[PDB]
Amino acid sequence: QDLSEALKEATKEVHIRAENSEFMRNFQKGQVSREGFKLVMASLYHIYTALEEEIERNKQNPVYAPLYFPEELHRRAALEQDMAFWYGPHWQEAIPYTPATQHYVKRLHEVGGTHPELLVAHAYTRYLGDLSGGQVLKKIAQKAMALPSSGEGLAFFTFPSIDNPTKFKQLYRARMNTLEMTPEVKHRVTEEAKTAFLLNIELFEELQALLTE
Numbered sequence: 001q002d003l004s005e006a007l008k009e010a011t012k013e014v015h016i017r018a019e020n021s022e023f024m025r026n027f028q029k030g031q032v033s034r035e036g037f038k039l040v041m042a043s044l045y046h047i048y049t050a051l052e053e054e055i056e057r058n059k060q061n062p063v064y065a066p067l068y069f070p071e072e073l074h075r076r077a078a079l080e081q082d083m084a085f086w087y088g089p090h091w092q093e094a095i096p097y098t099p100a101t102q103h104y105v106k107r108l109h110e111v112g113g114t115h116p117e118l119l120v121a122h123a124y125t126r127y128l129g130d131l132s133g134g135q136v137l138k139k140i141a142q143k144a145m146a147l148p149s150s151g152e153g154l155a156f157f158t159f160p161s162i163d164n165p166t167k168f169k170q171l172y173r174a175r176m177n178t179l180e181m182t183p184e185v186k187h188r189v190t191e192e193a194k195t196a197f198l199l200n201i202e203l204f205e206e207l208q209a210l211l212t213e
């Protein structure tokens, strides 16, 4: 079975759980506040910073390299734009770095530094989601918060080097399926993708509690 399929199958249950965290339930209903949106975007800033650091570290490593698409996919620059928008010109000292965010970053560094053959799990979990369900969440955030179509404040959700997310996502899948796979690697990849999803659930659980306080 192709890696792209094995990952979708392995994570379909946990994906249902992630969508039904209280934070994402409220988000999907159009209930997201500026405060709650700033917290989740700042946390994604740290997460994608760490993810992309480890991507760069491993760009030439054949357990990752066929998925090296910085121009198309990488989000750090976009997230920097969004931080300036939501937090102002001194955003680097204003933004929070929550403990659940720290925990996700920690595991990203463990994977990139000691288990790079699992980095595909983390890239899959973030980028493929960003290219599908992320586009729906974009439209909901725009409507909730009166964000302009010109795209300010939502750079994270915009892929100006990808014409068509559906076709790109098919290419990314196809390339995933060229990675050298053994039963060992494949089983651990799908396990790590479940962990990536849990790390996101745990963030959303944390941010909700911070917001409810």
Ligand code: HEM
Pocket: 004, 007, 008, 015, 018, 019, 020, 024, 025, 028, 124, 125, 126, 128, 129, 130, 132, 133, 134, 136, 137, 197, 200
């Ligand atoms: C309310 C929150 C969310 C909604 C409404 C949502 C919605 C979607 C939708 C409509 C798809 C396309 C499904 C398909 O093509 O069959 C999708 C795919 C995906 N989503 Fe989400 N999602 C949400 C949260 C998440 C979270 C929190 C993650 C991980 C952090 C995530 C990761 C993914 C991944 C990796 C895929 C690709 C599945 C694949 O094609 O292999 N999503 N999502």
